[PDB]
Amino acid sequence: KDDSKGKTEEELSDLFRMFDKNADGYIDLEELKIMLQATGETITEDDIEELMKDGDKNNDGRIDYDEFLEFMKGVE
Ligand SMILES: [Ca+2]
Ligand SMILES: [Ca+2]
Numbered sequence: 001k002d003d004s005k006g007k008t009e010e011e012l013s014d015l016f017r018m019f020d021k022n023a024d025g026y027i028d029l030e031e032l033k034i035m036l037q038a039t040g041e042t043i044t045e046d047d048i049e050e051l052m053k054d055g056d057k058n059n060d061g062r063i064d065y066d067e068f069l070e071f072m073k074g075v076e
Contacts, residue, residue: 012069013065013069015072019034026063026064029052032048032052032055036048036051051075055070057070
């Protein structure tokens, strides 16, 4: 095995409780930036700023289990 990949909408739930830098049940544009460093993708606040924008199902400031399910839905 090397990189056969295999992550469905079910493996995303864990990605949320696993990328919670603050670990408070939800995340904020502040921690969402570190989540990208875990995968690389070098970018500035110009790309991350919009990442959380459309990533928030209701744009409230943080992403929960729901807003997170859609976040990865259009974020690969
Ligand atoms: Ca948090
Ligand atoms: Ca929200």
